[PDB]
Write a protein that binds this ligand. Structure first.
Ligand SMILES: C#CCNC(=O)c1cc(NC(=O)C=C)cc(-c2n[nH]c3ccccc23)c1
Length: 281
């Protein structure tokens, strides 16, 4: 504690070293500030956890921090630059991302292109596989609000609930018991939602009505007439295997033709992202 490390360089720091650029509405019940580190001009996200704060909130902030601090070797999980501890507060300095896939979809007012969702799929599957294999963590809440993007073209799993521990994204076997395969289902619903710009059970008025459609209806499909590659349609069809005992695990998805393509294909996510942000001021 008491220092930040940013691109391998370690800087002594305390909270006085940071200029408060205002709240970021990340939809948490804890204060998160955008802050400028005066020593270097880096802009960062700083969580402020008050000693007098809500006990539920503080506990989950610390459980998430525990996983982030041990995830320095995953390029697909948002990183902690450092912590400051005072008599009344803990400040947690995080990588500042641009936005969440949920907000990106709201701003776009339409589909996100397959080539962006390909780079997103590689990153999030590798993140969830890293969490399970390295830390024994089942994430249990995969959805667009937990997928972060920035103007440098990085796509990372959010720290929010990253320790594990709506029901729009819930797998059939979690609704009605018969495991990482439930998160594979959530990923499939997230991809259909982002690819179409339409949540696949949209006309539901209550969370229970959504659960009834997950169980009673056919899994949602990518539409056939939007020029989606055969690889992307097959990837989503596999994720949305209703019987979980036939649904692939991450090690199997990581061999899928869709992920192999996007591991090596050059996609300028950064310029797409800045463009979308430009076309939407
Ligand atoms: C203005 C401006 C610049 N950036 C944003 O507003 C912005 C917006 C969002 N939105 C959401 O997560 C919503 C789903 C998230 C983040 C973010 N950066 N770093 C993080 C570490 C952990 C959790 C969240 C974040 C930054």
């Amino acid at each position: 504690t008491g220092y930040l490390t940013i691109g391998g360089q370690r800087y002594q720091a305390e909270i006085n070293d940071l200029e408060n650029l205002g709240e970021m509405g990340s939809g948490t019940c804890g204060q998160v500030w955008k802050m400028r580190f005066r020593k270097t001009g880096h802009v960062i996200a700083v969580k402020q956890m008050r000693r007098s704060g809500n006990k539920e909130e503080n506990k989950r902030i610390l459980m998430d921090l525990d996983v982030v601090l041990k995830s320095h070797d995953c390029p697909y999980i948002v990183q902690c630059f450092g912590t400051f501890i005072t008599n009344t507060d803990v400040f947690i300095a995080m990588e500042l991302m641009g936005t969440s896939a949920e907000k990106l979809k709201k701003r776009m007012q339409g589909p996100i292109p397959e080539r962006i969702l390909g780079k997103m799929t590689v990153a999030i599957v590798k993140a969830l596989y890293y969490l399970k294999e390295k830390h024994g963590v089942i994430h249990r809440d995969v959805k667009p609000s937990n997928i972060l993007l920035d103007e440098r073209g990085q796509i990372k799993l959010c720290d929010f609930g990253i320790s594990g521990r709506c029901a729009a994204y819930m797998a059939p076997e979690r609704i009605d018991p018969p495991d990482i395969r439930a998160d594979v289902w959530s990923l499939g619903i997230s991809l259909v939602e982002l690819a179409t710009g339409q949540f696949p059970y949209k006309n539901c008025k209550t969370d229970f009505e959504v659960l009834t459609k997950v169980l009673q209806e056919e899994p949602p499909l990518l539409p056939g007439h939007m020029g989606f590659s055969g690889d992307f349609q097959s990837f989503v069809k596999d994720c949305l295997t209703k019987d979980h005992r036939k649904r692939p695990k991450y090690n199997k998805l990581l061999e899928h033709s869709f992920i192999k393509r996007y591991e090596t294909l050059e996609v300028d996510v950064a310029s797409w992202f800045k463009d979308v942000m430009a076309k939407t001021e």
